[PDB]
Design a binder for this molecule. Structure first.
Ligand SMILES: Nc1ncnc2c1ncn2[C@@H]1O[C@H](C[C@@H](N)CC[C@H](N)C(=O)O)[C@@H](O)[C@H]1O
Ligand SMILES: Nc1ncnc2c1ncn2[C@@H]1O[C@H](C[C@@H](N)CC[C@H](N)C(=O)O)[C@@H](O)[C@H]1O
Ligand SMILES: OC[C@H]1O[C@@](CO)(O[C@H]2O[C@H](CO)[C@@H](O)[C@H](O)[C@H]2O)[C@@H](O)[C@@H]1O
Ligand SMILES: OC[C@H]1O[C@@](CO)(O[C@H]2O[C@H](CO)[C@@H](O)[C@H](O)[C@H]2O)[C@@H](O)[C@@H]1O
Lengths: 249, 249
DNA sequence: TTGTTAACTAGCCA
DNA sequence: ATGGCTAGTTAACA
DNA sequence: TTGTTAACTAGCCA
DNA sequence: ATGGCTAGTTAACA
């Protein structure tokens, strides 16, 4: 694999010790949500106080690995977001809560509540001096839409000419099973979302840690965009897929 | 003043005794977020532990008013939601976390974080047997979309023939100052989303409590849908607007 | 145009 | 305390 | 077609 | 301690 792409087929909680502290620029964490999915293991078969307990366990291993300029995005479900976010706010400062609007709702058959269509992303920072560069993640307008938004009072503004902030709600559809990007993983994440996080919060060439990389989506994002990557995945097939994904760019 | 609609220019926290315990079917709470706004008072000038203590205070007076079949929606900001939702999960059960996608981002000037385009809403219930009816709030398809979505596998399905679950992300644009629904209030909530709350979670004839009603958006929703309403707002200018909005029906 | 499917069924009754 | 049966669930990829 | 604005800048310096 | 100054911020209503 490319230079700084480290794919470790190891359990993160037993191998984090090997990771030097204050050595990571960004953590992109998409840990098991506690939703009972089949990852080839029981990672997502915990729930309630056990899952929160386990979530603190790995969080405490990972946080020290952050450089004083580093940041972290952590995916979770509204079912455990308040407790997780509350805990992280005693360790880090929360810069943002990003809502990933997945467009395609979860199935089931319910009629007694609203259907799930968002995941929660918590954007945290070690200190007020965190690295964040908006320019590479700015969304430029097409011609028609730029014409619709332009006004004398805005002419020349950066948001208008270079592009606008993605905001705290990211509308990006889940990857259909037949989507070109899809691989044999149950909980894949659109590269679009992961790349944005990598480009705005990791200095180019910086190091990004993904404690539970699955298909190496973060790896791919770091490969392109030129950034370093350390990642752990217990499932060997996932580690496999990941290598494949990174050895195709 | 229509019958069933009752409006008060008082502090809820001090008049809660007047509200019989277990008399309300739904609480639509759009309380101060803790963001520095000026409602003619300093209610939104609290922050940190001081905001949350006040938040959990009025919450403790409101909850016992909910009948066993009751439910609640509480608007809040990501900056205090994890704490608020964590506290409420110890009292009630959380059925959903609804994201209000405001569409129009907050202004300021930053480039150091993601701009805000969502407020948070916690949907809670006293008991597992909470009232909830989706049919009044199903979103029907237009000829074009129904055609795009229809497949033999889905033909005859309630969600296709009648309309879909609005989901837990609600993309409804904030009300522009020049919008015909806009009245002189700094933080008005679109009736579209308040009405949805009233329709799904309050039986026709039920009583709705809004402890910080502001401009009366919940009063109007109930009036238009045949629900009873009780509301509180310490600012009389706002209270007058609420009278007007209700009376113009 | 179409087959297919994706991190987040649930209330009864037995 | 625990299943299983039912009526029920969408946007977008190929 | 264009004016205008909405629940949530942020760091520096005299 | 405290303004003030800076570079800077969008979709949609009328
Ligand atoms: N202790 C552990 N160490 C490393 N990986 C783990 C551990 N426990 C669970 N996992 C993996 O973490 C992954 C969580 C997934 N959400 C990762 C998905 C990944 N973001 C993707 O886009 O493909 C699963 O594939 C698990 O197998
Ligand atoms: N103790 C209190 N009792 C009643 N109202 C209060 C109290 N404290 C603050 N408020 C009001 O609560 C309101 C909160 C607003 N967000 C209401 C807006 C309302 N949802 C609307 O759509 O117009 C403000 O108008 C405050 O003045
Ligand atoms: O408020 C529901 C919320 O609680 C969670 C964990 O945060 O589950 C806990 O509470 C449930 C209450 O219905 C219990 O069923 C469950 O056993 C307990 O762990 C989430 O499941 C849910 O989002
Ligand atoms: O700090 C950004 C600041 O700009 C404000 C201040 O009024 O307003 C925006 O909209 C105004 C109405 O025309 C413009 O005059 C102003 O230049 C523009 O930035 C607020 O939205 C915001 O706090």
């Amino acid at each position: 694999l490319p230079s700084g792409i480290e794919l470790h087929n190891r359990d993160f909680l037993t191998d984090a010790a090997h990771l030097p502290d204050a050595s990571i620029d960004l953590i992109v964490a998409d840990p098991p949500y506690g939703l009972g999915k089949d990852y080839g293991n029981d990672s997502d078969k915990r729930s309630g106080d056990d899952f929160l307990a386990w979530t603190r366990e790995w969080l405490e291993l990972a946080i020290p690995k952050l450089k004083p300029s580093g940041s972290m995005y952590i995916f979770c479900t509204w079912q455990y977001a308040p407790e997780i976010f509350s805990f992280l706010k005693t360790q880090l400062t929360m810069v943002n809560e990003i809502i990933w609007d997945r467009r395609v709702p979860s199935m089931g058959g319910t009629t007694r509540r609203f259907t799930s269509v968002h995941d929660n992303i918590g954007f945290f920072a070690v200190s007020r001096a965190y690295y964040f560069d908006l320019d590479p993640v700015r969304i430029p307008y097409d011609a028609d839409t730029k014409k619709a938004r332009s006004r004398k009072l805005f002419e020349g503004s950066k948001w208008l000419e270079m592009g606008y902030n993605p905001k705290d709600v990211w509308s990006v559809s889940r990857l259909h099973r037949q989507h070109a990007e899809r691989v044999d993983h149950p909980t894949q994440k659109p590269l679009e979302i992961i790349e944005r996080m990598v480009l705005a919060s990791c200095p180019p060439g910086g190091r990004v840690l993904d404690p539970f990389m699955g298909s190496g989506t973060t790896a791919v994002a770091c490969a392109r965009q030129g950034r370093d990557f350390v990642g752990y995945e217990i499932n060997e097939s996932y580690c496999a897929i990941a290598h494949e994904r990174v050895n195709a760019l």
